[PDB]
Scaffold this motif. Structure first.
Motif: not given
Lengths: 130, 130
Positions: A11-21, A23-26, A30-35
């Motif tokens: 999960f930490q590795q996934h968060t690290a990649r997500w934050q890099h790509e 930066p303004d949407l965790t 992202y899940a809140v906007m999708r729902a």
């Protein structure tokens, strides 16, 4: 090792990649906007489960999205505690631009599994849940 | 559904049970104390990987543990930036009391899987990691 320990590592590795790509949407943002896009006008209390959040975390996050023109909300006339959530036109633009980015981050980890391994990994996670 | 979405759901359910049973020791705090006990005198920079944390998160958490008499640290004479971490006698008591509690919380979710399903779930998580 502990299964939930390596889950934190993955999960930490996934968060690290997500934050890099993104930066303004965790991922919780992202899940809140999708729902909201999946169910326009969803009640805020129902958005808690649909986006995997909490009542306090969602209320904080929706207030920031509202202040940035990404989220629009209305209230129940009989109970102003109940609110319904919509994405604004700018919110739809932000979500639409993030979906291909977020899908590619998931694919970096899920793509290392075969189709049978992916479908089965979903079965084990569902079997562990309450 | 998204595999990483249901992983958030399973992780949130695990955190909710962990917070109820161990109100004063989160999983990242518990993992830090476990890694110090596994390697007394571990360098703080090595503790980052061993406990799945970050340099800033670990430094904040160790400072609070130190202020509560649970963690003892020494410094490299040639570079005070490098620190080595030990558990105090009170820290050993806190960790020893939490291990059976934390194991039971993991068992609530892992116990729903067979031994083959548990061993394989660990294989898929390891296969997805970088």
């Amino acid at each position: 090792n502990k299964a939930f320990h390596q889950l934190r590592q993955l999960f930490q590795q996934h968060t690290a990649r997500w934050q890099h790509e993104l930066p303004d949407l965790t991922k919780p943002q992202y899940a809140v906007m999708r729902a909201i896009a999946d169910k326009p006008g969803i009640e805020q209390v129902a958005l808690i489960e649909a986006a995997v959040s909490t009542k306090a975390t969602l209320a904080e996050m929706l207030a920031r999205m509202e202040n940035r023109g990404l989220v629009r909300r209305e209230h129940d006339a009989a109970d102003k505690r109940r609110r319904f959530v919509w994405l604004t036109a700018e919110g739809e633009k932000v979500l639409a631009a993030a979906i291909p980015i977020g899908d590619s981050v998931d694919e970096e980890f899920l793509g290392r599994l075969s189709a049978e391994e992916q479908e089965l990994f979903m079965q084990l996670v569902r079997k562990m849940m309450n």
